[PDB]
Ligand binder design. Sequence first.
Ligand SMILES: [Zn+2]
Ligand SMILES: [Zn+2]
Ligand SMILES: [Zn+2]
Ligand SMILES: [Zn+2]
Ligand SMILES: [Zn+2]
Lengths: 74, 70
Amino acid sequence: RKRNRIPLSCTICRKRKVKCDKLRPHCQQCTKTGVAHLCHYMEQTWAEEAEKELLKDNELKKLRERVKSLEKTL
Amino acid sequence: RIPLSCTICRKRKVKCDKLRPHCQQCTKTGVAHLCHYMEQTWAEEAEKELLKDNELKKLRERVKSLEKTL
DNA sequence: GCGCTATTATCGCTATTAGC
DNA sequence: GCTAATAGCGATAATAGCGC
Ligand SMILES: [Zn+2]
Ligand SMILES: [Zn+2]
Ligand SMILES: [Zn+2]
Ligand SMILES: [Zn+2]
Ligand SMILES: [Zn+2]
């Protein structure tokens, strides 16, 4: 009866086995120890949808600033 | 009908404290940025995200047209 | 770097609500 | 009275991370 349980801590803290604060997008542990941008988290099954949404919202936002920027250029 | 528990706690099947802007369950697990509450029915929301999908496609197409014309 | 235990988090099942 | 729908518990699988 395995449970598909994915760690919420970041890969580095997990690999190093240290305390993870879980800060996004990069945790304070990684930042405090000089590997901030090496910090990332595993995708959660129950987060996929909420992620798809956040990202999609960001894309419409940036794509629109882009249409405006391009137009406001040529 | 519109659920009172944030979508994540719903999917996680845990009790939501329904605190805003983000509940403590999401907060504590580090996913507060993904914590949100529904403002409309599931049908209304699904339809909204469907239109977003299409508008997105049309945008990516417009940017190509625009830049690939610059 | 990792072993070992404390604490956490998944998912089947139960309790409760909504509806016929 | 009964079946579906939604919420949410809780047993236990499995991580978190202290401390060596
Ligand atoms: Zn971390
Ligand atoms: Zn970075
Ligand atoms: Zn990190
Ligand atoms: Zn919640
Ligand atoms: Zn939440």
